[PDB]
Each structure stands twice: as C-alpha cells, then as structure tokens.
Design an enzyme around this catalytic site. Structure first.
Site, PDB file in Angstrom:
ATOM      1  CD  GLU C 161      -1.580   3.959  -1.299  1.00  0.00           C
ATOM      2  OE1 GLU C 161      -0.468   4.445  -1.845  1.00  0.00           O
ATOM      3  OE2 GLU C 161      -2.238   4.338  -1.157  1.00  0.00           O
ATOM      4  CE  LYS C 220      -0.468   5.081   6.929  1.00  0.00           C
ATOM      5  NZ  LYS C 220      -1.771   4.904   6.270  1.00  0.00           N
ATOM      6  CB  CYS C 276      -2.264   0.553   9.460  1.00  0.00           C
ATOM      7  SG  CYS C 276      -1.585  -0.651   8.354  1.00  0.00           S
TER       8      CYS C 276
HETATM    9  N1  LIG Z   1      -2.800  -2.725   4.510  1.00  0.00           N
HETATM   10  C1  LIG Z   1      -2.841  -1.260   4.268  1.00  0.00           C
HETATM   11  O1  LIG Z   1      -3.715  -1.200   4.063  1.00  0.00           O
HETATM   12  C2  LIG Z   1      -1.840  -0.797   4.217  1.00  0.00           C
HETATM   13  C3  LIG Z   1      -0.683  -0.705   4.990  1.00  0.00           C
HETATM   14  N2  LIG Z   1       0.636   0.411   4.712  1.00  0.00           N
HETATM   15  C4  LIG Z   1       2.028  -0.079   4.929  1.00  0.00           C
HETATM   16  O2  LIG Z   1       2.674  -1.399   4.183  1.00  0.00           O
HETATM   17  C5  LIG Z   1       2.996  -2.187   4.912  1.00  0.00           C
HETATM   18  C6  LIG Z   1       2.890  -3.122   3.811  1.00  0.00           C
HETATM   19  O3  LIG Z   1       1.218  -3.796   4.386  1.00  0.00           O
HETATM   20  P1  LIG Z   1       1.111  -4.774   4.354  1.00  0.00           P
HETATM   21  O4  LIG Z   1       1.332  -5.253   2.787  1.00  0.00           O
HETATM   22  O5  LIG Z   1      -0.786  -4.890   4.038  1.00  0.00           O
HETATM   23  O6  LIG Z   1       1.196  -6.286   5.035  1.00  0.00           O
HETATM   24  P2  LIG Z   1       2.129  -8.027   4.562  1.00  0.00           P
HETATM   25  O7  LIG Z   1       2.130  -8.621   5.846  1.00  0.00           O
HETATM   26  O8  LIG Z   1       0.477  -8.297   3.547  1.00  0.00           O
HETATM   27  O9  LIG Z   1       2.582  -7.814   3.116  1.00  0.00           O
HETATM   28  C7  LIG Z   1       4.044  -8.010   3.814  1.00  0.00           C
HETATM   29  C8  LIG Z   1       4.543  -9.111   3.073  1.00  0.00           C
HETATM   30  O10 LIG Z   1       6.189  -8.312   2.794  1.00  0.00           O
HETATM   31  C9  LIG Z   1       7.112  -9.743   2.232  1.00  0.00           C
HETATM   32  N3  LIG Z   1       7.821  -9.355   3.158  1.00  0.00           N
HETATM   33  C10 LIG Z   1       8.681  -9.177   3.867  1.00  0.00           C
HETATM   34  N4  LIG Z   1       9.462  -9.077   4.611  1.00  0.00           N
HETATM   35  C11 LIG Z   1      10.338  -9.496   2.945  1.00  0.00           C
HETATM   36  C12 LIG Z   1      11.460  -8.947   2.365  1.00  0.00           C
HETATM   37  N5  LIG Z   1      12.638  -9.270   3.240  1.00  0.00           N
HETATM   38  N6  LIG Z   1      11.769  -9.341   1.894  1.00  0.00           N
HETATM   39  C13 LIG Z   1      10.762  -9.892   0.960  1.00  0.00           C
HETATM   40  N7  LIG Z   1       9.171  -9.695   0.835  1.00  0.00           N
HETATM   41  C14 LIG Z   1       9.316  -9.899   1.981  1.00  0.00           C
HETATM   42  C15 LIG Z   1       5.662 -11.045   3.519  1.00  0.00           C
HETATM   43  O11 LIG Z   1       5.813 -12.071   2.884  1.00  0.00           O
HETATM   44  C16 LIG Z   1       4.571 -10.312   3.220  1.00  0.00           C
HETATM   45  O12 LIG Z   1       4.072 -10.806   1.734  1.00  0.00           O
HETATM   46  C17 LIG Z   1       3.159  -1.814   6.284  1.00  0.00           C
HETATM   47  O13 LIG Z   1       3.958  -1.498   7.244  1.00  0.00           O
HETATM   48  C18 LIG Z   1       1.539  -0.411   6.298  1.00  0.00           C
HETATM   49  O14 LIG Z   1       1.510   0.181   7.645  1.00  0.00           O
HETATM   50  C19 LIG Z   1       0.456   1.668   3.782  1.00  0.00           C
HETATM   51  C20 LIG Z   1      -0.850   2.106   3.855  1.00  0.00           C
HETATM   52  C21 LIG Z   1      -2.070   0.283   4.077  1.00  0.00           C
HETATM   53  O1  LIG Z   2     -17.253   5.062  10.418  1.00  0.00           O
HETATM   54  C1  LIG Z   2     -15.916   4.178  11.319  1.00  0.00           C
HETATM   55  C2  LIG Z   2     -15.084   3.515   9.996  1.00  0.00           C
HETATM   56  C3  LIG Z   2     -14.080   2.379   9.978  1.00  0.00           C
HETATM   57  N1  LIG Z   2     -14.691   1.675  11.285  1.00  0.00           N
HETATM   58  C4  LIG Z   2     -13.662   0.787  11.747  1.00  0.00           C
HETATM   59  O2  LIG Z   2     -12.556   0.968  11.397  1.00  0.00           O
HETATM   60  C5  LIG Z   2     -11.178  -0.403  10.978  1.00  0.00           C
HETATM   61  C6  LIG Z   2     -10.728   1.148  10.107  1.00  0.00           C
HETATM   62  O3  LIG Z   2     -11.623   1.051   9.253  1.00  0.00           O
HETATM   63  P1  LIG Z   2     -10.488   1.120   7.198  1.00  0.00           P
HETATM   64  O4  LIG Z   2      -9.726   2.794   7.549  1.00  0.00           O
HETATM   65  O5  LIG Z   2     -11.311   0.754   6.137  1.00  0.00           O
HETATM   66  O6  LIG Z   2      -9.282   0.348   6.926  1.00  0.00           O
HETATM   67  P2  LIG Z   2      -7.994  -0.059   7.029  1.00  0.00           P
HETATM   68  O7  LIG Z   2      -8.613  -0.145   5.040  1.00  0.00           O
HETATM   69  O8  LIG Z   2      -7.277  -0.541   7.060  1.00  0.00           O
HETATM   70  O9  LIG Z   2      -7.218   1.821   6.205  1.00  0.00           O
HETATM   71  C7  LIG Z   2      -6.680   2.497   6.865  1.00  0.00           C
HETATM   72  O10 LIG Z   2      -5.530   2.520   7.667  1.00  0.00           O
HETATM   73  C8  LIG Z   2      -5.106   2.491   6.071  1.00  0.00           C
HETATM   74  C9  LIG Z   2      -3.199   1.744   6.048  1.00  0.00           C
HETATM   75  O11 LIG Z   2      -2.824   2.545   7.331  1.00  0.00           O
HETATM   76  C10 LIG Z   2      -4.928   3.822   5.427  1.00  0.00           C
HETATM   77  O12 LIG Z   2      -3.708   3.446   4.791  1.00  0.00           O
HETATM   78  C11 LIG Z   2      -6.636   4.176   5.375  1.00  0.00           C
HETATM   79  O13 LIG Z   2      -6.332   5.729   4.568  1.00  0.00           O
HETATM   80  C12 LIG Z   2      -6.952   4.326   6.300  1.00  0.00           C
HETATM   81  O14 LIG Z   2      -8.415   4.377   6.275  1.00  0.00           O
HETATM   82  C13 LIG Z   2     -12.416  -1.031  10.309  1.00  0.00           C
HETATM   83  O15 LIG Z   2     -12.406  -2.382  10.699  1.00  0.00           O
HETATM   84  C14 LIG Z   2     -14.095  -0.671  10.448  1.00  0.00           C
HETATM   85  O16 LIG Z   2     -14.682  -1.264  10.438  1.00  0.00           O
HETATM   86  C15 LIG Z   2     -15.494   1.782  12.320  1.00  0.00           C
HETATM   87  O17 LIG Z   2     -16.060   1.823  13.188  1.00  0.00           O
HETATM   88  N2  LIG Z   2     -15.887   3.419  12.174  1.00  0.00           N
END
Ligand SMILES: NC(=O)C1=CN([C@@H]2O[C@H](COP(=O)(O)OP(=O)(O)OC[C@H]3O[C@@H](n4cnc5c(N)ncnc54)[C@H](O)[C@@H]3O)[C@@H](O)[C@H]2O)C=CC1
Ligand SMILES: O=c1ccn([C@@H]2O[C@H](COP(=O)(O)OP(=O)(O)O[C@H]3O[C@H](CO)[C@@H](O)[C@H](O)[C@H]3O)[C@@H](O)[C@H]2O)c(=O)[nH]1
Ligand SMILES: NC(=O)C1=CN([C@@H]2O[C@H](COP(=O)(O)OP(=O)(O)OC[C@H]3O[C@@H](n4cnc5c(N)ncnc54)[C@H](O)[C@@H]3O)[C@@H](O)[C@H]2O)C=CC1
Ligand SMILES: O=c1ccn([C@@H]2O[C@H](COP(=O)(O)OP(=O)(O)O[C@H]3O[C@H](CO)[C@@H](O)[C@H](O)[C@H]3O)[C@@H](O)[C@H]2O)c(=O)[nH]1
Ligand SMILES: O=c1ccn([C@@H]2O[C@H](COP(=O)(O)OP(=O)(O)O[C@H]3O[C@H](CO)[C@@H](O)[C@H](O)[C@H]3O)[C@@H](O)[C@H]2O)c(=O)[nH]1
EC number: 1.1.1.22
Lengths: 454, 323, 460
Positions: C161, C220, C276
């Site tokens: 994602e 990723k 992340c």
């Molecule tokens: N938050 C972001 O912007 C993004 C994160 N990711 C990746 O996706 C993953 C998901 O991260 P988030 O959703 O943000 O974390 P989060 O901590 O918000 O979500 C994890 C959820 O899964 C539950 N959980 C954990 N183990 C479980 C199990 N065995 N059974 C059922 N529920 C369980 C937890 O209680 C929690 O509510 C991470 O590894 C992250 O690196 C990928 C893209 C974007």
């Molecule tokens: O020019 C910039 C852009 C961002 N940030 C900072 O960098 C951090 C990351 O920002 P952002 O990229 O929006 O964070 P996320 O919302 O977690 O998303 C990033 O991390 C996700 C989880 O891996 C990926 O899915 C996305 O592609 C990637 O943008 C934040 O604290 C921002 O304030 C800066 O300081 N300068």
C-alpha cells in the site's frame, strides 16, 4: 617429615574430589575438608552429595569417617593439620576496579589470614586455587608480617565430569615452591603425598611463579583450541566444508593432537573465561597490550559463536520467536556433571528469552532450582518452564535446541517428537551429537541445523 | 592474500596449498585434492585426499605402497582444501601462543621453558611446537594465515578474520620487541655500532631464508643505522644481499665468512637461527675482542644453561622468556 | 474465471480500514469484512466517531457500512468465509532482543498466518499489504506448506500500500500505481489476476503492475527510501542555508524546477515522522547487514541520522536562544500530529522536540486541532509529564505568557493566528521558532510586531 594431617579450606569441585582421592590413596593420612557453607558440608556427609561427579560417590563413601572428614569447624582443622590446601573460589570481580576482568582474591586473603590466626609451629600452606602470577608472594608477605609457615603452589588440572579418573591417573602434578632450603624441603614433602599413587616422572617441580603461570597458560591453550576449531566451524558453514572432517584431519597431525577439537555452541564452565580474562587483566598492569589483545580473541570468538548460534535460531524461525515454545535440551555446561557455571545454555536461553520465547528446559543432572536461579536476577515466571522429562519440553515446540552433549539425546524418538511439534519443525544441534542421524530427521520432516554444516 | 595467478591449471586442457572448483569450470568449458605436510614423506602422520570416486582410490592405491589405509583420509574437496590451511593455522598459532607467554614470563620471573614443559604434559595440549623463539618463518605459515584472513574478509566473516590475524600480529610483535630489546639495552641507540647477526635461515638445517625472522631483525637494526655483520653456515652470501635489498645494504651490511670475524669489535651478538654450532662457540674468545659492555641476544634459547659461564665471562645476556 | 466476492482484512488500522472502505465503495458486489482483535477499535468504526481522522473517510465508510462493508471482532468467521484475505497488521520496529531498534517485528504477521491456516479450507488468496522485509512472504508460504490440509490451497500474494495519511482516501481512489507480486508459476498468476480484477473496477489497467513477491516487497521499501531521502536531503541543505545566507525555500524551488528532480517532497522541516518512514529505512538497513551489504546499509542510514540531526539542531536553537536554560519557562507547542490533516502522532517530530524541552525542565503547553488529549499524554510518558505538560484548548491559551512558540505541524490554521494579540501577552524577548516554513512572508509583519522569528533554512 611425612605429612600426617591435611586440611583443605574449600569443599567445592576441587577440595572435595581432590581430598577424597588423597584419602582413598593414602590411608595413613587424616584429611579434613572444611568450608563455611554449612549446607555444603552437610551435603558432603549425605547420601546425596552436593556435586554430581562420576565415580565421586563411590570414592567418598569409601573413606568418610575412616580418614575423610567434612566439617564446618574451620579452625581446629588448620590448628592440627600439617598441610593446609587452599581450594576456595577465585571468581571474576563483579565490582570495583577491574570489574569483569580481574580475579577476586578476597576468598584467598580470607584463608591466609585465618591460617595464621589459628596455627602454631610448622605447617605447609599450598595454593591449589587458580591465582595470578606472584599471588604466592602475597601469602608470604602476610606470613612474614604477623610472625614458621611455607607457601607452595600445586594447581589442579582435573576437568569436571572426569575428575576422578584425572585425579587417579594425572598427566602430571605441578608443585611450585621457594628455590630456598626451607622451600625445597616443603616441596619434596608434598611430592611424598602424591608419590603414594603418582609416578615420579609425572611429578613436575618448578618455582612459585612458573607454576602459578603454567596453570593459566595451560587453560589458555585449551580454550584457544576450542575457539580455534569453533572459528573454523563458521568458516565451514560458509564454504560447505564440514567442521568434523576438518577437525579430524587437523588432529591426525601428531604435533597438533586430536583432542579438544570438537566444535560447539561455546565453551563454558567455571574457569576458562575467568582465567583468560584474568590473564588479560594481568597484561594491562604489566604494559603488555599485544599479549592482552591476543588472548582476548579466545573470549570474543566464544561470545561470537554463542551469538551467531542464538541468531541462527531466531533467523530460521521466520525472524520472530515471541510467544513461541522452544525446547532447550541440556543446561549443564558439559556432559556428566551438574555444574551450570558459565554454561552456554544460560546464554542461549537468555538470548531466546529476550525475544519473548517461552522456554521449556530439561537436563538429567541439573536441579531445577539452579536453572531458575541462573536465568534470573519477574521475567522468569512468565517465560521459563522446567520440564521433568524431555518429551514434555518438546510437546508443541517450534524447535529443539541441544546445548549439552548428554549421550541420551541421540536415544530420543524423533518420530514421536515430530508428531507433537508445531510445524514446520526444527532441531538446532549445538553439540554435533546428531551427526549421521540427519537423513532420518530429514525424511521425518524435521529441519536440522548444526554447527559447522552449510 | 593468495597470488593464484591458474597458470598451472589452464595449461592442462590433483594439487599446492589453495583456497579447484575453478578447474571444474575450465574443464567444463580428474580433479582431486592431495596437499602435503622433510624426508615425513616416508612416514606421514596421514595422507589427505579429497573429491566429490574411484579416482580417490587410484591415489589411495599409489600411496598404499608405503602408507596404510588407516592413515589415509578421504573427504569432500572443499574440506580437503580447508584442512591444509587450518593445520598450518593451529601449528602457527601454537607458536604465537607460546611466544606471547614468553613476554609474560619476562615480566614476572617465570621461565618459558618450565612453563612450556608443564603445558605440554597435558596430553590434550600435546608438547610439540611449544619452543618460544624470535618469530616463526618459512614460506607457508604467514602466507597461509593471511590467505585465510583474506578468504574471511571475502565471506563476510570478520570475527574469524581478525581472530587468526592475531597469529600474524603476535609473531610481528615478537620480532619487533626483540629488535626493540636490542636497541634499548644498547643505551637507546644502535646507529654506527657493529652488531653481529648469527644465523640467517628460518629454521636450522636448511638454506631456506624465506620469511626468516633474521630478515626482520636485521631490517629493524638497519633502520637505526647499525653495522650488521652476518654469518650463516649454509645460506649463500648473495641470498643475504638479495633478502635485505630493495643503497642501504652496501653502507651497512657485511656478510662475514665465519662467526668470530663477525663478532670482532661488536657491541652485541644476536643469535636468530638455532644452528647447533652456536652452542659450541668459544665465547670467551669473542668477549675479549668485542667492545664493552658486550651483549648476547639469544632469540632461540640455544644458550640455556651456559648463562653462568657467559655471565661470569662478563657477557651480558638476554634471552626470550627469561629475565 | 475465479472472482473474488468476499474480502477479509485482518487489521482494522490506518491501512486495512480505508483500503477496504474504498474497495467496498467501488465494488458493490463484493463483501469486505475488516476484522481486528481490538474491540474498542472495531466498535469505533461502527460508531459515528471513527477511530482515526482522514478527510473524506467518514463519507466513504458511511456510504456502505452495513451493506457490503463490515467491522467485526469475529476474526475467525471472516477468514473462513473469505475468498481473499488481507494481512494488514502493523510491523513495528523490535523494541527488544536482536536488532533492537532496527529490525522489524514480524510477530503480528506470523500470528495472522497461523490463524489463517487454522481457520480455513478450500481456496483462498492470502495477500500481504503490511510492509515487510524482502522475502517475508516466503515465510508465509512455508507456514502454509507444513500446516497443510486436504484440499486446502492457500495462495500468497504481495500487494503493498502507498497511501499517505491525510490523503488516504484521495490516494486510494486515484493511486499513482497498484503493486501486486506473486510467484511466476501457473497457480500464482491465477491469483495475481484475480486481485487485479478487483482493482480493475476503479483503477486503470496500465497502472496495475504485476511482479514477483520479492520485487514487490523491495519496491515498497525502496520507494519509501527514496521519499524520506528527499526530506532528509532538503533538510540537509536547510542547515547549509542558515550557515551561508541562502534560503532553503528559494533553493528548493530552483531544484524542483529541474523535471528530472521534480518539485515534490522538498519542503524542509523539523524532521519527518509518521509510522513508516523511519522504521522502513531501519528495516532495510538491518536487512543489508544480514545480506553482507555493509555499504548499502550505511548509505541509507544517513537518511535517519540527518533527520535525527535536523530535529536535535532545532531543539538546540530554541534552547540556545533561551540562553541554555529553560527551567520553568513556559513554551507553546503548536502542532503534535506528524503532518497536517491527521490525528496520528506516530514518530511525530513534535514528540521529540517535546522530549528535548522536557529534559530542560520547560513548562510545555501543547495545542493540536485534531490529536486527542490523552494521546499526547501517552506519547510523552515513560511523573515528568505531570509537572511539565499542560494541554491547551486553544493556541492563545498556549501562548499566554510563553517565552517561545514552537510550530511543528503545518496546520493551515497557525498561519491565520492573531499574532498581534499573542505577542502582547508573551514574555519578552518573544520568540517564534517555525519548524514548517508556514509563516514565510509574514516575517516582516511579525518582526515589526516584535517577535523574534526563526525558521528552518533561513539564516539568522
Ligand atoms: N499507515 C500508513 O500510512 C501505511 C502503512 N503501511 C504498512 O501497513 C501496515 C499497517 O499499518 P497501520 O494500519 O497503520 O497500523 P495500525 O497499528 O494502525 O493497525 C494495526 C491494527 O491491526 C491489529 N492487529 C495486529 N495484529 C493483529 C492480529 N493478529 N489479528 C487482528 N488484528 C491485529 C492491531 O490491534 C491494530 O488495530 C504497517 O506494517 C505499515 O508499514 C503501508 C502503507 C501505508
Ligand atoms: O516535503 C516534505 C514532505 C513530507 N515531510 C514530512 O515527512 C513525513 C512523511 O510525510 P508523508 O509522506 O505524507 O507520510 P505518510 O502519510 O506516512 O505517507 C508516507 O508513508 C506511507 C507509508 O509507507 C507511504 O504509503 C506513503 O507513500 C508515504 O508518502 C511527515 O511527517 C511530513 O511532515 C517533510 O518534512 N517534507
Ligand atoms: N572446577 C574446576 O574444574 C577447577 C577449578 N580450579 C580452581 O580451583 C578453585 C576452586 O574452585 P571450585 O571448587 O570449583 O569453586 P567452589 O565455589 O565450588 O568452591 C569454593 C568453596 O570454598 C568456600 N570458601 C570460600 N572462601 C572460604 C573461606 N574463606 N573459608 C572457608 N570456605 C571458603 C565456598 O563456600 C565454596 O563452597 C578455583 O579458584 C578454580 O579456578 C582449578 C582446577 C579445576
Ligand atoms: O573439544 C571440546 C572440548 C571442550 N569443549 C567445551 O569446553 C568446556 C569446558 O570443557 P572442559 O575442558 O572439560 O572444562 P572443565 O571441566 O572446567 O576443565 C577445564 O578447566 C579446568 C579448570 O581450569 C582444568 O582443571 C581442566 O584441565 C580443563 O580441561 C565445556 O563447556 C565443553 O563443552 C568443547 O566445546 N569442545
Ligand atoms: O616449537 C617450535 C617449532 C618451530 N618454531 C619455528 O616456527 C617455524 C616452524 O617452521 P616449520 O614447521 O618447519 O615449517 P615448514 O617446514 O614450512 O612446515 C610447516 O608448515 C607446512 C605448511 O603449512 C606443514 O606442511 C608442515 O607440517 C609444518 O611443519 C620455524 O621458523 C621454527 O624456527 C618455533 O619457534 N617453535
């Protein structure tokens, strides 16, 4: 004069066997073995001795009360003895200057001062404890201050588990003493005691310093071999060679010898690491940092070998071991003893505990209270169970970890073990006890990893 | 690191001490291992043969004329190539370990000979290759440690790499602290003082000088400006010149044809090779003709016992592993 | 042939919930069931007050909650009924043992895989959305190959994602691309194609890339690398700007006009946060130390160190301008979220700046428009918090009598504050430390008012 009464301050893994063997060999000599630990003394007077040593139970029961005694009354044993052994422990200081490196001589100092407070006339004080070089000069300064006593060095070479055979048939006996008239009379007196059962060609006499230093040097060479062959095992793992073939090969060269070439998860036991550390810390004061950092590699490799192996396990279990049941077969530091001092099992267990793994630990001769003690300082209540038999430890286990070469670990029914382990199953063989048994385990479906195989 | 520059291999389309799978790719576009461990050829402790199968048995068939199959060990090829190295490792490491002990002895009043004796009676340790010295020499030892060290650097095994690297380092230390010892005893300066170097071979009963500790002691004393007079019974004159070259050599090095002329007017006699003829020397003659105070640095423990005579003759003597 | 008609997603977090709400919104004919162990969370999804803050999410969820979108603690039954299973759990950094502070904690993933292969029969597609190390799928494949059943045929995919928080709904609806990885076999490519069919409902086909599992997982990570590297790179320049007289915003503009470089992610800051970026770099740095790639590890490690330096530099400027003493000095923290338009605080530079000023004994008054109050209290704990931390109901209360105002989150509202009024009731001298460049161009007005204003990348 012929030595007629012998005292040994310190009834541990040295004072107990060494005096039992002196009494069994020399029936016209009174051997009293004393100690401050009253429970230890009482156990030495029990049907269950305080240490597991093959043959030791026979030897003790053959003399206790004839000429072999175990008493808490430290003073009278010295007062009436002709020769006082010092066989007390010399751990690594855990405090102060040199913490973690220097040897703690406070227990030796205690003997030296209680001897002179409790003795008159002529007596022979022998240092059997593994001391630093010139420590026998320190006892001499004490005795020449609070003023007739002589000071000798007679290190021990018994290895635990084979202590009785080694004491009856020693490679050599080392007696070190003053190069004076008074000193050489005291040395040939101790020779007389040993000459009851050791041939004269195998009794080696030198001066006090050369003796104190021979003991450390010998333990360095021994420990160096293990680390040396252990380092080769990591080399083998990366080139598909086999550490046992390489070791067998190396050992056919007579000048190398064939002994002490068995790769392992890491050497343990009360002495090697503390003695190496001791010698390194000696070297800093003597302005000898090359010697210091040379022998330090014997310890680094050991620590590496253990860590490398602990990581072997975590990596293979898909990099996480939290909440996973793992079986630890073998907690003693070697086979045929119950001593767990510096056992690699502690270090693997502690590594696995840091990952949050639930451990189930089995060992034939190690009592459960020792394991609980060794693994603590709770974290232990949560994570550590101690199993009555092995099959219990492996029930529902993700992996079987062998840390000690108890011969019985071959004898196990891995058909049965495999049926009740979670899948996929692993065996981590830290002692190479399962060589040849691989294909079986492979077909059964076990994934088997050992030291020195790719 | 290993100068493998193969030149043997490609010419062909059994082994040397190598780090063979390159052969099987050249040949892919009869390969066994059989390394060596002097006139040892006759009663080898063991004969090593490695492969992947009747070819090991052809080579067992040839050795069997004078070696019994018990003493002949077969294995995989990688394990054969490794075993040659690791042997020399353990051997060279014994020497460096005992050398390290000598420094300890010198600083505490123990005798390295008493300590080594006591060490070697432990059958597990064994009592071979425990004679302290000024440094091990010869073609294979240092070459083989370094080779394996490089092999470890390229397998990302630095713990292992640096563990064996101590065998070389401590040998280097043993050689330099001896040199340093000569210089410190002669009042911190050795510039323009004649020093007799006795023995240029790496062990006794050979002409071989490859990596002889004599080379490095001489070079150390050359950097100070000493006037070295070298004599060695069998090592040819021109090999000494070559071994100390790369002019510095002509200004400082005399190759003497006998030990008494190299010791004449010397400040010190530095024995580096264990030739027995050095024990039998007329040392009372040497001392009358040397400058005072005269010194003897015995880097080979060859003068043991004779100390009282030498010390009473007026010689000042320093030896490895005994103050 | 085979059509996904029931989606289970283990993990109801910032990924699982939005990705499934969008999936369900675009596909009326598929039943998306998001499950979680956290009952307080699941229950918040079924409430009008969602557990997270995302612009537009409340609309999308309410659009099909109860129709084809569901949130349940019934993790077991959703698995057994599902045609596709999303593993969407968190992969934090290990806080213990081997690789502490570096390596990824895979325990939550491993928990999913065993609960799946226990509760499941027949044909299912197991898809790994969580960010994992390269080859982490292969571990799931092995778990399934030893714990197999009659006629069980579990297929394993990588579908990482890329949504950013604060834009998640917009990103999920027009994603720059979709990434799917699977084994280059007959069986795998079937499952690969069945997942495309889902995304094909709303995403252009050309933007749907199919690769092998490894390549997917590594992509990723590498993308997240390249992203953070830009921030740390511009943050590095900002330091050189304050030392030379240059201006990072002017320099950033000039750089991003080169179309080979591009003009995004060049906005210098007090430092990047979010859950992340830091962990994913460290995860990869760790991965290299096992792969015997020490030069690649230390190359990427610089992204983390520069960001740790950007933060500590800022904290030191504040402390230095207050003459290295801050004891009992009031200071306003405007912004605690790690970026604007989110409630998330994970790894927000605001925490680290607050920790640096709490080690100085300052009295922090913190205001955020969206972060809940107990979150800030949790994030600043492990009482030091009791004595030093007040949480403000509005920014003016937070600046009442403050020595300094530290802006950490680029919330559009801070730029509109009544700075004339703030200044009257501040202690003089009265500093504004702008860690987001949100106040550029107001420097002249803020300076005639009397504020001492400083910002990342502008020389003093
Ligand atoms: N938050 C972001 O912007 C993004 C994160 N990711 C990746 O996706 C993953 C998901 O991260 P988030 O959703 O943000 O974390 P989060 O901590 O918000 O979500 C994890 C959820 O899964 C539950 N959980 C954990 N183990 C479980 C199990 N065995 N059974 C059922 N529920 C369980 C937890 O209680 C929690 O509510 C991470 O590894 C992250 O690196 C990928 C893209 C974007
Ligand atoms: O020019 C910039 C852009 C961002 N940030 C900072 O960098 C951090 C990351 O920002 P952002 O990229 O929006 O964070 P996320 O919302 O977690 O998303 C990033 O991390 C996700 C989880 O891996 C990926 O899915 C996305 O592609 C990637 O943008 C934040 O604290 C921002 O304030 C800066 O300081 N300068
Ligand atoms: N364990 C082995 O295999 C060998 C050990 N050694 C050395 O011999 C020594 C003995 O070690 P162990 O017997 O294994 O240790 P240990 O701990 O079993 O024995 C020491 C005993 O001495 C007692 N003690 C200590 N100070 C005392 C004092 N002042 N008065 C009376 N009793 C006192 C202690 O209560 C203890 O029971 C150590 O220095 C060791 O390095 C030498 C050869 C072999
Ligand atoms: O080839 C080998 C030999 C030993 N070990 C390990 O080495 C450790 C110690 O073995 P051992 O030498 O028997 O220990 P100790 O019983 O303490 O005896 C050693 O230490 C004593 C105290 O200094 C000396 O008296 C002995 O001579 C010396 O062998 C154990 O954990 C073994 O598993 C190996 O891994 N491989
Ligand atoms: O107790 C000893 C024995 C030797 N040395 C010195 O160490 C070196 C040992 O040389 P040596 O063992 O004779 O070298 P080689 O003749 O090259 O053969 C050795 O190295 C070969 C290649 O690794 C092996 O095949 C042999 O078994 C092994 O003896 C010499 O410089 C000796 O002066 C000592 O200082 N103390």
């Amino acid at each position: 004069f012929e030595i007629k009464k012998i005292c040994c301050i310190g009834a541990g893994y040295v004072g107990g066997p060494t005096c039992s063997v002196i009494a069994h060999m020399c029936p016209e000599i009174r051997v009293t073995v004393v100690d401050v630990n009253e429970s230890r003394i009482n156990a030495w007077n029990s049907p269950t001795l305080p240490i597991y040593e093959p043959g030791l139970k026979e030897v003790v029961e053959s003399c206790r009360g004839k000429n072999l005694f175990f008493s808490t009354n430290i003073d009278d044993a010295i007062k009436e003895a002709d020769l006082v052994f010092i066989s007390v422990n010399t751990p690594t200081k855990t405090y102060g200057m040199g913490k973690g490196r220097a040897a703690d001589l406070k227990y030796i100092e205690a003997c030296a001062r209680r001897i002179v407070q409790n003795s008159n006339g002529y007596k022979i004080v022998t240092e059997k404890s593994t001391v630093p070089v010139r420590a026998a000069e320190s006892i001499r300064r004490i005795f020449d201050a609070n003023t007739n006593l002589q000071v000798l060095s007679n290190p021990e070479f018994l290895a635990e588990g084979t202590a009785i055979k080694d004491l009856k048939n020693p490679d050599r006996v080392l007696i070190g003493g003053d190069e004076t008239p008074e000193g050489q009379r005291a040395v040939q007196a101790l020779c007389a005691v040993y000459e009851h059962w050791v041939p004269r060609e195998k009794i080696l006499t030198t001066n006090t310093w050369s003796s104190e230093l021979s003991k450390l040097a010998a333990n360095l060479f021994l420990a160096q071999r293990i680390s040396s062959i252990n380092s080769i095992s990591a080399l083998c793992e990366a080139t598909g060679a086999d550490v046992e073939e390489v070791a067998t090969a190396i050992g056919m060269d007579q000048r190398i010898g064939n002994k002490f070439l068995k790769a392992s998860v890491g050497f343990g036991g009360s002495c090697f690491q503390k003695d190496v550390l001791n010698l390194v810390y000696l070297c800093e004061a003597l302005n000898l940092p090359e010697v210091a950092r040379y022998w330090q590699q014997v310890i680094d490799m050991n620590d590496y070998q253990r860590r490398r192996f602990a990581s072997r396990i975590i990596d293979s279990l898909f990099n996480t071991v939290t909440d996973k049941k793992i079986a630890i077969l073998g907690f003693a530091f070697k086979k045929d003893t119950g001593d767990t001092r510096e056992s690699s099992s502690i270090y693997i267990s502690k590594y696995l505990m840091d990952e949050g793994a639930h451990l189930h630990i089995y060992d034939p001769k190690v009592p459960r209270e020792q394991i609980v003690v060794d693994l603590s300082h709770d974290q232990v209540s949560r994570l550590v169970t101690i199993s009555k038999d092995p099959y219990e430890a492996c029930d529902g286990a993700h992996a079987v970890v062998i840390c000690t070469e108890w011969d019985m670990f071959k004898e196990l029914d891995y058909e049965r073990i495999h049926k009740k382990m979670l899948k996929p199953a692993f065996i981590f063989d830290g002692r190479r006890v399962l060589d040849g048994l691989h294909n079986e385990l492979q077909t059964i479906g076990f994934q088997i990893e050992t030291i020195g195989k790719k």
